[PDB]
Amino acid sequence: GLSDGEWQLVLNVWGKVEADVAGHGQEVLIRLFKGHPETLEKFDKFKHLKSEDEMKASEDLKKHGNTVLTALGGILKKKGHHEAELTPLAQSHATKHKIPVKYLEFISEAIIQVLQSKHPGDFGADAQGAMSKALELFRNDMAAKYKELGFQG
């Protein structure tokens, strides 16, 4: 449900993430886990991190943040015509990783916070509104797929 100009604002600030995907991805998962501690409990591999300093040092957390934002970028570049990219993620998150839809709101919040924290000058009011709409469209489509698969949306 985005306009073409709102997709361009999203893809233009996504270019800042592409200049450093793993660094943004690491900061998103740290913000997700420090903001909403219960999300960390879905990651069996990341329990042992008892602090933001242990999370910062974890090369596996950084590698997983990289994988997370590389997939999200694949989804955003499709501008809404993203069913083929979205399906595999809704499949794996609804079944194997046991992620509720609400946790998707939390990581959406962490992404905006990261973008605002790292690019305050480039991520103004128009870019913010457009990225919020993009992440809402992703969340909504993820939830519709979960319902299709027999899960709570």
Ligand code: HEM
């Ligand atoms: C923008 C939203 C998200 C994206 C793009 C994303 C993407 C991914 C990708 C690409 C993988 C590896 C492939 C796969 O298994 O599907 C993955 C794994 C995983 N995701 Fe996400 N994810 C998102 C949100 C979440 C949230 C909010 C949680 C938990 C609160 C979560 C939990 C996990 C877990 C537990 C795994 C498996 C990790 C492991 O290797 O041990 N994901 N995610």
